[PDB]
Symmetry: C3
Amino acid sequence: EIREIQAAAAPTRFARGWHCLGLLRDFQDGKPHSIEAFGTKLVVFADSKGQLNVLDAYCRHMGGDLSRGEVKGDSIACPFHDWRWNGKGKCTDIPYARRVPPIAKTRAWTTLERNGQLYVWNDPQGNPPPEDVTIPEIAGYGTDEWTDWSWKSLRIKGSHCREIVDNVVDMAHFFYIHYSFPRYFKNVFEGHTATQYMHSTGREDVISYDDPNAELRSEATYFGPSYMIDWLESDANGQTIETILINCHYPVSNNEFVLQYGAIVKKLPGVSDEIAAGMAEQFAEGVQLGFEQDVEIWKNKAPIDNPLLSEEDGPVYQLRRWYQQFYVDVEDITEDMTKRFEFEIDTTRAVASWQKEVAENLAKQA
Amino acid sequence: EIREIQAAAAPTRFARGWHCLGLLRDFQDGKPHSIEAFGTKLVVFADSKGQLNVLDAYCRHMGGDLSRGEVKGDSIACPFHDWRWNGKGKCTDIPYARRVPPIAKTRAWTTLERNGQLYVWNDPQGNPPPEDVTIPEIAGYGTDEWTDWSWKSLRIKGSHCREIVDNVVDMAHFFYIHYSFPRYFKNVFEGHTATQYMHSTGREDVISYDDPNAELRSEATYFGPSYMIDWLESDANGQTIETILINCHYPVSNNEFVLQYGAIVKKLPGVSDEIAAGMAEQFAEGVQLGFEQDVEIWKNKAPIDNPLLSEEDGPVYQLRRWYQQFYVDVEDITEDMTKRFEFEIDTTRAVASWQKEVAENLAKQA
Amino acid sequence: EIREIQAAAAPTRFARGWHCLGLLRDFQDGKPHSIEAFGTKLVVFADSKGQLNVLDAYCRHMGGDLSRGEVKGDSIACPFHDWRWNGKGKCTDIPYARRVPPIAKTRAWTTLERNGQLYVWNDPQGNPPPEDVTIPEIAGYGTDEWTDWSWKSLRIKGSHCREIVDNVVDMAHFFYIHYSFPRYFKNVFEGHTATQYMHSTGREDVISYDDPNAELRSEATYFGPSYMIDWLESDANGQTIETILINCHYPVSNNEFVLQYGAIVKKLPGVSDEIAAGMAEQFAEGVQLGFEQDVEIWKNKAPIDNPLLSEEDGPVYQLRRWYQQFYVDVEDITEDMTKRFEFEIDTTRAVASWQKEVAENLAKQA
Ligand SMILES: CCC(=O)NCCSC(=O)[C@@H](C)[C@H]1CC[C@H]2[C@@H]3CCC4=CC(=O)C=C[C@]4(C)[C@H]3CC[C@]12C
Ligand SMILES: CCC(=O)NCCSC(=O)[C@@H](C)[C@H]1CC[C@H]2[C@@H]3CCC4=CC(=O)C=C[C@]4(C)[C@H]3CC[C@]12C
Ligand SMILES: CCC(=O)NCCSC(=O)[C@@H](C)[C@H]1CC[C@H]2[C@@H]3CCC4=CC(=O)C=C[C@]4(C)[C@H]3CC[C@]12C
Ligand code: FES
Ligand code: FES
Ligand code: FES
Ligand SMILES: [Fe+2]
Ligand SMILES: [Fe+2]
Ligand SMILES: [Fe+2]
């Protein structure tokens, strides 16, 4: 009878799509920057104009680390013998030799500079990104109406990055882990994008303040495989506090990945830049604690390809079907991966059950 | 000519039998307790009545760690979504869903609660323990006549647990490592149990006190593969000081194992509970130093399936033949494993040789 | 077009030849000494006379670590059961048993005691060293005219020891890494020995003093695969300061190796033993910083069997052809490995290019 767990070996291959490697301001200071990603090391530097360039970190001459080098003009100087390489990956200048060989070309990585952020496009097939596959421009970033990012990062070891994407369908953990109250849950999976819609409230059995029915309306969408944006809103004190929360990650290796996230808020009327920036901080700091709680779950949990779902669980398999799209060749993608699938959880019993617990635990004091 | 060493790969498989995972008082406090054993993780919790239950640590729903959970009633609540699992391994209650699937069953581990201790039965074939395979009840544990355990543990990395069992036939190390004087040595190997009989004394070249011929009579028996009990006695100050020393271990993985041991003493007449407990402590503290010295031997030694024995060495091969019984299927056990084999070392020359050294080293001072 | 890197798996096999395991004074104190080398552990002890002996560290009886033992007479006493083994590897005496088996023989390692140093000969084929394969005696070590070694060591992890030998042909790194000025460079590769000849000067853009054209004449030769000696000379203050710098290494495993080096100076006329020894120290301390800078290069670099060389690069492939000699059977060596190959780099443009940089960087201050 006993149901056993199925742990298939984690994928050696890495996902095809845009992966966010952090803010432009962090890469716009002239220096190069090493990054261990996709089972190797990349170097990211910024030419005189400002354009950020990305190549393989290992120099083709003697294997030197180009990220330990120095930027000179619009080329990267290797710390070993100061060979110069440009954005496109062609050796421009050898300082002690007359001229360079034409076959001196290294792999340049296709980049996109948007939303105050840097994206790289990994694709083991090696082809450039299509037209319809990209990253949305956020309503109005850059202008004074929205604050700058309260951006933060964690480095996770000992597990695969599949199970951060699994959170898209896990309504129940928001209660028992993050200490919120889901009242609504719907998911939509279109070709290469995966969505979560959620209306959630706080729970009364917590110490300081929020309204008795302080409610938040979330709307999160992976523009897959690794990059999510979340539009958030709560109508309190008359007007609505809009917030945009970014969740994005990238793999280092199959066993390890980096996790990035940040938040900006629209400037409410009658509020300064600092008060606005403080709201963004508090929100990100609150998410910080959230993902810290996930990490302890993720760190101690075992991988499992055969879940046993109840009737209140979201569509795990259809999420992991859609997510399989990115680890396979584009030519081998099937309809069942990119199809339109939608599903809403009947939370009526779930919330009724959670009301018993929240009230029961209030009576215990004082 | 040169004799070479034979290091065959350590067994992936784990031994079949009762393994002691420590004292009942350490698991009787309501909380769950994680334990990494047998190439995986188990969770051990105690229901309301007191009965200790053991299952696989990884939850069948989403792989959550049940040892990071909480006990509610007579079920274990998963820290991920608070699913409830009972002693037998059936899901009893999902708090946010109406009812549970009948196919929600996880692997329960067969347990035995005895001698103030908890044993689990691992057996890769998956069958329950027979009738004649078990653990002896100690003469009279529980009553006031015997003290509670001075119980202690070490965690050993970088070697297999075979070579703690090898100590059963190694008379010579007691001298050069543990600093005792063996006068007698006999071994008996019956079906699934392995015995050592030893009469040993102290050596005069040690600093403080013991009698000039202070003698100890040991009688140790593995009720194999992992669990040993040792009856000890010394007749001093008129009456006999009886002691019972437990040696027991369990594997974490092929490359790592935990080592547990403890001692109780019979209350001598005219002696309080505290003085009695102090004798148990001193003895265990003296063994502590002993096994610490073994660890340095075990840590720096290499594994070796082809020893080169002298004429004063105990039966290594016949010990490792008997010990092979537990890593093979019960159906593939042969007579040579379970046979009656007995052997006594003629120590006459050995002790004569050690008398030269002990006396020689007294003359060096002062 | 893009040129890709070729990282073939590092050799499991270890090089055939003399490897220097350090100074005789460090092994001449009676105690044994463990050493992890050649994918295993060796023990090195010194008999009563003084002769250093080397065997496998793991005792053939029960695998005990002989390096954790004690020397008694001209035999090594095992810390487990004090079995005694002599220089040739025969068990001499079991202290608690009457006599020893004749088949008790362990592997002794062929040694050479010279230049205040100890060499071992590894050779996976197991044959002794020929006549013409050895280590030169240094002009006049031992006498008062030359000081004792300022000897030093580093332990390098995460890379193969091939690429310290690669430095033999890398003129360019001396400039950009070590901050010197190469004016001359020639290499010679005879059967089993590899040579570098270099005339180098300091560069004027450095803070404190040296002459405006303070020049050094280097002459380094690997008596391969692992052992190099370097004769150095600079004619300053009328007479010539001769120096002899040793570079030598040995592998621990394919992924890790130890790096040793030291320097002695000829006593100039009118100079004491201490002033002389201080010159040796300063030189070794200056090399220290040098190899420390290499380690950061070696630590961050990737292995690469397909370099892309310019017209000012030394003969990498012909160095690695000659170096392949030692990882193959002696019977499978070809002419192209042991042939006479010589090559000199036309440095005229290289030095002209480096003069622009050194002068340009002087103008920047103050
Ligand atoms: C108390 C005020 C405060 O500072 N609160 C902290 C921000 S609210 C919070 O951290 C949690 C209750 C929830 C609320 C929104 C949740 C995110 C929804 C989008 C999302 C979809 C996923 O699939 C996975 C994660 C997120 C990013 C959710 C994380 C938890 C959040 C922020
Ligand atoms: C000085 C008074 C004192 O506190 N002595 C410490 C206890 S005596 C001691 O540690 C050692 C000298 C010896 C004496 C009995 C030995 C055990 C016999 C049973 C045994 C069989 C084995 O195969 C392996 C280990 C043991 C548990 C022996 C360990 C060493 C002991 C305790
Ligand atoms: C400033 C005075 C002083 O203390 N100088 C430090 C000694 S000079 C030094 O460290 C470097 C500039 C150079 C000079 C000689 C170079 C060695 C030549 C032989 C050699 C051949 C190789 O293939 C690899 C390394 C060496 C040992 C060279 C290391 C760098 C040296 C010492
Ligand atoms: S390693 Fe990049 S310059 Fe040679
Ligand atoms: S992981 Fe145990 S409740 Fe889902
Ligand atoms: S291990 Fe060397 S004496 Fe037994
Ligand atoms: Fe979460
Ligand atoms: Fe022992
Ligand atoms: Fe160097």
